[PDB]
Assembly symmetry: C4
Homo-oligomer: 251 residues x 4
Amino acid sequence: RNAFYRKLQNFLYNVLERPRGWAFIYHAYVFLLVFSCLVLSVFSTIKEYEKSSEGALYILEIVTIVVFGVEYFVRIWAAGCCCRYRGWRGRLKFARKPFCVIDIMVLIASIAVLASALRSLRFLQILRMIRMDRRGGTWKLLGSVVYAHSKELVTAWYIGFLCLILASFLVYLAEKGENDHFDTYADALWWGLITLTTIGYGDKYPQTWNGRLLAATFTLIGVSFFALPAGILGSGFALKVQEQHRQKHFE
Amino acid sequence: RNAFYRKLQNFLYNVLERPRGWAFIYHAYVFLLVFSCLVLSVFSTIKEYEKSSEGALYILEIVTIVVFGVEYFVRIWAAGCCCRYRGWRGRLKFARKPFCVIDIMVLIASIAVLASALRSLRFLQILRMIRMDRRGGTWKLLGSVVYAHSKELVTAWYIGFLCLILASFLVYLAEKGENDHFDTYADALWWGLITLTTIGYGDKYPQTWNGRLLAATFTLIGVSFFALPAGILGSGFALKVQEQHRQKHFE
Amino acid sequence: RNAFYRKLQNFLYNVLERPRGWAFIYHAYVFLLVFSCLVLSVFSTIKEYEKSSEGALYILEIVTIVVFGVEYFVRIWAAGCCCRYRGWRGRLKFARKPFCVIDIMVLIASIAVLASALRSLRFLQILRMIRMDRRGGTWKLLGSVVYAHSKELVTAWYIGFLCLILASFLVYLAEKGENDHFDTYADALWWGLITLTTIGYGDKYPQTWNGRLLAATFTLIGVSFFALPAGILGSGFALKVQEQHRQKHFE
Amino acid sequence: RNAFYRKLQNFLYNVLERPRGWAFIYHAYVFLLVFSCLVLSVFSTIKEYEKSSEGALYILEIVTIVVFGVEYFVRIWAAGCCCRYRGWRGRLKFARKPFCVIDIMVLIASIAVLASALRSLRFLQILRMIRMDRRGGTWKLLGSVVYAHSKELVTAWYIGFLCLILASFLVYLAEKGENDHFDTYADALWWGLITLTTIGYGDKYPQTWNGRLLAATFTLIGVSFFALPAGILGSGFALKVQEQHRQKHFE
């Protein structure tokens, strides 16, 4: 009777803590519960779609609080699997983890909201999505790659920033009188920031020949300097994962 | 007489199944037939260009049904080339392939449409374009590269998503009263999604100083996090094809 | 007297044919002459800026025809440097080159225009910019890298195309009645093509909740599939030039 | 007494000249002083936000002139650390550096402005941001990578430029009569430049079927050719920093 006990204890510990394969099926369905509750709470703030949305948001919040309740409780129970945490003192030593106090605070708080209501419920679902990491693996991966490429990212930002100020000043000089778009300097800076990221809202565009002649040169230079750091970090991620594949095929 | 028989049988089998060189000339012209029929069927749904379009769409549909008819029939006939499929039982064993039932269902269905008509014909040309793979080589290439980079794509989406929600909430707080663009939260989320992908329709843009000060920081961070996964998969494809070139120059 | 003769002959042959270093100074100034004549001819087609533009365009066309005249004539004269072309028969054997007939046809044609006038002159300056290669080095570099990555570019285009048709059909179904933007299918296809390339003109945008819910998912998938082939060819160019640097540092 | 003297002299020399770690904390706070003075001077040019902005801009300019004063003076004093510059003649030999005359000219000039006033102060803060390099490390890194990839950047610009002229001419031919957007050739060139960089202001868009049919093909080709050089330089930066990591892990 203890055999199937400990066998399922390590099975649930490996599905609830670091998973490998079809355990991501369970982590995807819990992410779909918190994502569907987030979208439905967005549909609840509109005045005309409020009745249908909250009519389903009540049962979906009860379902999410139950599913998170049993997943927390059997994370504590399946923490008795591992060779370090075992026993009453070991399980309560797992209660000493600050992430477990965070998760139990959120869970009792969702009971308290279900005992500006929907805005607090929306804050609690956002914090459950931040809770989904439990290890900062996304933050640590981004921090390692950003720190590895710090000289090129600073170079891309610094040269793009100086091109932004030069382009905005030259266009403002060209189009101060003949255009109500470019009334002050700050309007030229907002035009340059929206153009050089290739957003292009269209509320401000140069309408003289001087502004179009100057912006034609500076757009070709500047949008490259602003599209750089996505390319630098993109190839940094791909090179890092390629060498990890080779350093896995050895060991 | 059997020599030229089997010689042309393997020639047509290698042009109709996996081709190498100038056989892609034939596969490009059949793709141009289905693409020209798709564009002309789009021109047929407009009320003022309907007579010219359907006047040519009749003969182009008869041509496409004939060309696909002979290509199907001599795929069955040239399946007698290969050392496994040969004979009446072997050719009908090639009829047992589920892709061949799919192709023969589409072909008889285009006869049935030529015996909401143009919308069904348009569905049949779309399914012929999906039929153009016959092996899922595009889906299998994308699936291998996406699965290889799953940790970075999840990191890019997760951090870009949290930046989207923070930027949309801060801009909404800044511009709830002084702007009819940002009336509810869902309008701030639609503004953030359209800006951070650098679409920039222009229907919603921040018009205060608070919204422009907050969106200036978050646009520089967020558009990088949304342009990441195209860079990650782009360098993943290029690194994969470079190592396949080196592992072809050995063997 | 023959020594300085042949020394300057090889010097001018190496500045006019394949240059290395500060000879690109001369090729940049001739490109600036043809670029300044192109921009000034664009300023000549506007009715209010026509007098100033053509007043300078006359002398700039005479200058460009003289500079190209002496560069052609001393390309023929400095073709007597190389060990193959030498003598009257050798120089006229260089006249047999089809690129030299192209260049001499353009040069006599610019005399003929200077003996719908400005539009023909604008065509002649465009063809001089195509003449600037003389070897197709840009076309051959692009053709080698595109042919090396043909399977991924076809995969990116094919999957982006199917996502475009699915997104445009779902948005059209959502917004046929409640929006004059999406009146026919072809308007939904034009909206999808302009959004998924992240242009975002703003003339068509979805205004219901159905269209915004469907376009929110498909924009995140589709703009990645359309930004792929610039990333694939960008990393293809960078990987190719890195290996050429290593295969130069050996030999 | 000389021991702590020289120990702190090399400590301050290594925090003020080439820093490594937590010395970038000090260089980040001085960059935040000049960035906050730049943003506040932008808020000062608007007529309605002028009183609050200049009320804080006075004390922030006095603070920046004091902090830069002591940092200059103890850069001269801590230049006595290094084994070459030491003594009265050595410190004044460091005054002979042209960057030190630049920095002392800016500092006395900010005293002179504090003895079109705010525009000159804004020019002086911009030149302090250019002064932040002191070595051109950003310009030298960009120049090395741009020079390494000069053949591909010229290929990307040349082929994108020819696609721009062909697309603009074909769209202009299609939409000269039926559209007030495309009145002259120069309006077609401005439409093509804004579309092919995927800005998409929306002031000019093709409204016929001819212009939309031609722009549909040329947008898919052209936006790739314009997004190329950001991808080429992005992967150039990532490949360069990867090989420098490997050539640091050896030595």
